[PDB]
Amino acid sequence: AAIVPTRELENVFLGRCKDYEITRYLDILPRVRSDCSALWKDFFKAFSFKNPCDLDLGSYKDFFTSAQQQLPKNKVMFWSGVYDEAHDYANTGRKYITLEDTLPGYMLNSLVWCGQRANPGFNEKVCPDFKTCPVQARESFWGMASSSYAHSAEGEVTYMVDGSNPKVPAYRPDSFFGKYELPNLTNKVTRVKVIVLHRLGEKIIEKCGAGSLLDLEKLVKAKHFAFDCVENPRAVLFLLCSDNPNARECRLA
Amino acid sequence: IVPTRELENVFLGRCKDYEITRYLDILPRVRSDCSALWKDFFKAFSFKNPCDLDLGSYKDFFTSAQQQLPKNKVMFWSGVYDEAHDYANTGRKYITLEDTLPGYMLNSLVWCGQRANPGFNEKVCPDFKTCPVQARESFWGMASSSYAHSAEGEVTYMVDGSNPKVPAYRPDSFFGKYELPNLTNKVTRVKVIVLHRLGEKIIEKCGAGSLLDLEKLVKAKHFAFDCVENPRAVLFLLCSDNPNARECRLAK
Ligand SMILES: *[C@H]1O[C@H](COP(=O)(O)OP(=O)(O)OC[C@H]2O[C@@H](n3cnc4c(N)ncnc43)[C@H](O)[C@@H]2O)[C@@H](O)[C@@H]1F
Numbered sequence: 001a002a003i004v005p006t007r008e009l010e011n012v013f014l015g016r017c018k019d020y021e022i023t024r025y026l027d028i029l030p031r032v033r034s035d036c037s038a039l040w041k042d043f044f045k046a047f048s049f050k051n052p053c054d055l056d057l058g059s060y061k062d063f064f065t066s067a068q069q070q071l072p073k074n075k076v077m078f079w080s081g082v083y084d085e086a087h088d089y090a091n092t093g094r095k096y097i098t099l100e101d102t103l104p105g106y107m108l109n110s111l112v113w114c115g116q117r118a119n120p121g122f123n124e125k126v127c128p129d130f131k132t133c134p135v136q137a138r139e140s141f142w143g144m145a146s147s148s149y150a151h152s153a154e155g156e157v158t159y160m161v162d163g164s165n166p167k168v169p170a171y172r173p174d175s176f177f178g179k180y181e182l183p184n185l186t187n188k189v190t191r192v193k194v195i196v197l198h199r200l201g202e203k204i205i206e207k208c209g210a211g212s213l214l215d216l217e218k219l220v221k222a223k224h225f226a227f228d229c230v231e232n233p234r235a236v237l238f239l240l241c242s243d244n245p246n247a248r249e250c251r252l253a
Numbered sequence: 254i255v256p257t258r259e260l261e262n263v264f265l266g267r268c269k270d271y272e273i274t275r276y277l278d279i280l281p282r283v284r285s286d287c288s289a290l291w292k293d294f295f296k297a298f299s300f301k302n303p304c305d306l307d308l309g310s311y312k313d314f315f316t317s318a319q320q321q322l323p324k325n326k327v328m329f330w331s332g333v334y335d336e337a338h339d340y341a342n343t344g345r346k347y348i349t350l351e352d353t354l355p356g357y358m359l360n361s362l363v364w365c366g367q368r369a370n371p372g373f374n375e376k377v378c379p380d381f382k383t384c385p386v387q388a389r390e391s392f393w394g395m396a397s398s399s400y401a402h403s404a405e406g407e408v409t410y411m412v413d414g415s416n417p418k419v420p421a422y423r424p425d426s427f428f429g430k431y432e433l434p435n436l437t438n439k440v441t442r443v444k445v446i447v448l449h450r451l452g453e454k455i456i457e458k459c460g461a462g463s464l465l466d467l468e469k470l471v472k473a474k475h476f477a478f479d480c481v482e483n484p485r486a487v488l489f490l491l492c493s494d495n496p497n498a499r500e501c502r503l504a505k
Pocket residue numbers: 077078079080081082083099109110146175176177178181
C-alpha cells in the first residue's frame with residue numbers, strides 16, 4: 001500500500017473555502033477577513049517546494065493566523081477516541097462547535113497532501129506514511145490546527161472521552177488533546193465539562209473521579225478551571241440508543 | 254428575498270468538493286464536468302423573467318446531474334425536514350435529496366433569472382409566493398421527480414402525525430405531486446414512518462385518516478406498504494433533544 005494524495009488539491013481547497021465563506025455556519029461562526037486566494041497562498045507555502053517530511057509546528061503558522069475564527073463562548077467541544085459520537089452530539093454546530101466545523105478543519109478535513117522539492121512543489125502521486133517523518137513534521141498541520149483552535153476557546157469547554165477502551169486511557173497526556181489542546185487553554189476558559197462515553201454492550205473501564213479521569217480533574221483544577229464529569233448523560237445515551245435500540249442500557253419501563 | 258452571492262463560484266465550488274470528496278463510497282460520480290453542469294443549470298433560468306419557468310426548464314440539468322441511487326436507501330419526507338435528515342444521517346442510514354449531487358450543490362441557495370444582462374439578478378428575488386405554481390415548483394419539482402425516478406427497491410417516507418392543521422399525507426405536497434407518481438417499477442415497497450412529536454397530541458395514525466388514503470394509493474400502484482409510529486430508533490433520536498419528555502422514560 002501507498003498513501004494517495006487528494007486530487008486537484010487547490011481546486012478542492014478553494015471550492016470548499018468559497019462554499020464555506022458564502023454559505024456555511026453563517027449564524028454560528030464568523031467570516032475571516034482573508035479571501036480564499038490569500039488562504040491558499042499561506043497554506044501552500046507551508047509545505048511546497050520541500051521534502052515531504054521537512055515541516056515543523058511553525059510551518060502553518062501564517063495559515064492558521066489567517067484562517068482562525070473567533071469561537072462562540074461555552075460552545076467549544078474537544079474529543080479523544082470518540083470522533084463519530086462527539087460530532088453526532090455537537091450536531092453540526094447546533095449544540096457545540098468542533099474543529100471540523102471551523103474554516104480550516106472544514107477545508108482540510110480528510111485531505112491528504114505533501115510537499116516535494118521538484119516543481120510543481122507538491123506530490124500528486126504519493127505521500128509517505130506519517131510514521132516515517134519526525135513527529136513535528138507528522139503533527140505539523142493538525143497539531144497547529146488543535147493548538148490554535150484550543151487557544152481561541154472561551155468560557156466552558158466540553159471534552160468527550162472513551163470510557164470503554166481497556167488499552168487507551170480516557171485521558172492521556174500523549175493524545176492531541178493532551179499535547180496541544182488542554183495545555184493551550186487560556187484564562188478565558190472557566191470550566192472543563194467531561195462526558196465519559198460508555199459504549200453500549202461493553203465493559204465499563206473508566207469512571208468520573210478515578211484513574212486518568214482523576215488525573216485530568218487535578219490537572220484542570222490547577223489551571224484554576226472548574227471541572228465536572230458525567231457518564232452517558234441522557235442526551236448522549238439517546239443517540240447511542242438510536243443506533244442500537246436493543247442494547248440493555250436502552251431498556252424501557 | 255435576497256439571492257445568493259457569487260452563485261457560479263458557489264455552485265462550482267460545491268460541485269468540485271462533491272466530485273472529489275463527497276459520498277465517494279455511497280454514490281456514483283456523474284459523467285459531466287463541473288463547467289458543463291453549470292452551463293446546463295444556468296441556461297435553465299438565464300435571460301428569462303425570474304417567473305417564466307416550467308417543470309421542463311431544468312430538465313437537461315437534472316439529466317446531466319442524475320445519479321443511480323443505492324437500492325432500498327432512498328428517503329422521502331413531508332413536514333419533518335430535520336428529523337428525516339437526522340435519521341438518514343448524511344448517507345449513513347438512508348439517502349436524501351440533499352446527499353445527491355444536485356441537492357447538495359443547490360441546497361439553501363436562492364437564485365433569480367432576469368431578462369437584462371447578465372441574465373440573472375444578484376440583488377433581488379421574487380418572493381415566490383408571487384409566481385405561477387409550475388414556475389415556483391420548477392427547480393425542486395424536477396429535482397423531486399428526477400430523484401424519485403432514480404429510486405429502487407424499498408423506499409421510506411417520514412411524515413408528521415402531530416399537526417392538527419396539516420394531514421400526514423397530502424396529494425398537493427411535493428411527495429404527492431412529484432415523488433410518489435414518479436416511482437418506477439424498480440421500486441417495490443413504501444415504508445411510512447409516522448412521527449409523533451414529543452409532548453404533542455397525536456393527530457395521525459397508521460391505517461386511518463390521510464394514511465389510509467395513502468396506503469390505498471400505494472397498494473393501487475402495485476407497491477407493498479407498511480407503516481410505523483415512532484419506531485424506537487426514531488423515538489430515541491427525538492429523546493436526545495428533549496430527554497425529559499414523558500415519552501422518553503427508560504427503565505428504573
Ligand atoms: C483537537 O484534537 C483532538 C482530537 O485528537 P485526539 O488525539 O485527542 O483524539 P484521538 O481520537 O485519540 O485522535 C484523533 C483520531 O480520530 C480520527 N479522525 C481524524 N479525523 C477524522 C475524520 N475527519 N473522520 C473520522 N475520523 C477522523 C484519526 O484517524 C485519529 O485516530 C480534538 O479534541 C480536537 F480536534
